Design a protein around this ligand. Sequence first.
Ligand SMILES: [Mg+2]
Length: 352
Amino acid sequence: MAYEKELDAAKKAASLAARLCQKVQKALLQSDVQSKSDKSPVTVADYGSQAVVSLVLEKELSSEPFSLVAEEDSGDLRKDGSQDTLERITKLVNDTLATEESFNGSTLSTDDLLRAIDCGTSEGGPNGRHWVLDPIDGTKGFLRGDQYAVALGLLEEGKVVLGVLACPNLPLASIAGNNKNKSSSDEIGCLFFATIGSGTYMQLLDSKSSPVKVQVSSVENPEEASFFESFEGAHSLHDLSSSIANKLGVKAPPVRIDSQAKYGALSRGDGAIYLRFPHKGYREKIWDHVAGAIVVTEAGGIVTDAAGKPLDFSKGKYLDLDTGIIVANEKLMPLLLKAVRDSIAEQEKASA
Ligand SMILES: [Mg+2]
C-alpha cells in the first residue's frame, strides 16, 4: 500500500482509540440510567480518543513533526476542579496505553495528557502533511449503544491520501441486508482503511484475521439502489433526498446508520447511495468526511458535491461545497447527478 508506514501507525492508533471508547460505553452502568451522570462519558471518550490517537501517531511516526487537525483543545480540562474528569481520563488513557509494549514504564501524568491534546492544533491547508481526526463521530449513537466510529485521515499537500475508520459496533455482515436475520453472528467490530491508489480493505477490529478487499455495490438500476439515512435525523433537507429518490424511483428500503460508519458500509456494498445536505449556516468540517471519502473512492465509489466537483480538503477545517455531498458508484452517479441538480433547480429554485 501507499503510505504503508503511516497506514500501520494509523490502524494501531485508531484501534486503540476504539478500545478506550468501548471501555467507556460498556461501563455505562449497563443500565439505561447510567447513574444519571452528565455528558461525562462522551467528553472523556472524546478527549481520551484524541489523546491516545495523538500519543500513538507521535510515537510511531518519529520521523516527522506531528500535525493534527482536531476540533477540541484542552481549555475545558483547566477551568474548575475538573481533575475529576482530567484524572479519570489520565487513568483511562494509561490503562488503555498499557498493552503497547512501547510506552511501558511511562504512566503519563495529568499535565502530559493535556499536552497531548494541545499538541494537535493544526489548521489543515494546502501545504504540508496533516492528520485529521474525529475522536468520536456519532456521539448520540455512542450513548444509545448504536453505531459510532473513529475517523482518522491524512492530508498530503491538501489531498487525502489515507483514511481509517474504526466502527466497534458495526457487524462484519451487511447491515442493510436485514433479510439475513441470522444469529448474533458474534463477528462485530470493523476496521476500514485505504490509501491512495491502493484499494479499500476491511478487517475485524482487534483481530489478527486477514483483511479483505471490499468494493462498492454494482447496482445498475436506480430502483434497487439503497439510500443511507440517519437513525434519528428526520428533516435535514429530506425534501431534496425525497424528490431525488422520486425521480430515481427508488423502492428499496433505506439503511439507517448514525455515524461516519455510513461510509464504511457503503464501501463494502451494503447501500448504493448516500446524500448529505447540511442545514443553512452550518459549515461541514473536514474530520466528518475525509477518512470516509477515500475509503469509498478506493473501493470504486464516486464522492462529489452537487456540481459533480470532487471534494477539496485543502481550504482548512471547513469544506466549501455545492449544496451537499453525493456518493454512489460509477453507474448510478450520472443519473443521480441529473436527479439532484434537477431537484435543486425544481422544488428548491421554484420557491422564487
Ligand atoms: Mg463530528
